[PDB]
């Protein structure tokens, strides 16, 4: 029975995962690349696993070796049930990482409109810039993701009051 807690979480092997987490304090242990079981479950869209890991003390704010978050991994794939559960934990929705990204920029790069709406609704800032000076709107314009552009422009209109 030789699989890591990370792979058990990715596979939704609920009973084996639950057994492992109960036996030893490994719920937040990182793999050789800095990823936690929660990050593995989020990147694999394992909604039930995410729920279970959160109920049992998985830290949703723990970051990977390049400052990747469970939130950014879920945003990048448009896993919006998982993004919701994570936002509900009060994670930083503006986490800036070392490959340059924010959860909103990943949701934009994948044209995940529902995800983009959900992030803005929780405080994501679309005009945060990368080191080369572009923001989420700039990205959406360049990719030609028009529904995304419309969602972001509605948000910026609201910022005009002010």
Curated annotation (Swiss-Prot):
**ANK repeat intervals:** 1-32, 33-65, 66-98, 99-131, 132-162
Range covered out of full length? 149 to 310 of 313
Instruction: Outline what the protein does.
Output: May regulate the interaction between the 3M complex and the histone deacetylases HDAC4 and HDAC5. May also regulate LRP2/megalin.
The protein depicted here goes by the name: Ankyrin repeat family A protein 2
Keywords (alphabetical) are: ANK repeat, Cytoplasm, Cytoskeleton, Membrane, Repeat
> Would I find Acyltransferase among this entry's keywords?
no
Q: What is the effect of changing residue 40 to A?
A: Loss of interaction with CCDC8. Decreased affinity for HDAC4
- State the membrane topology: Peripheral membrane protein
Keyword presence, Protease: no
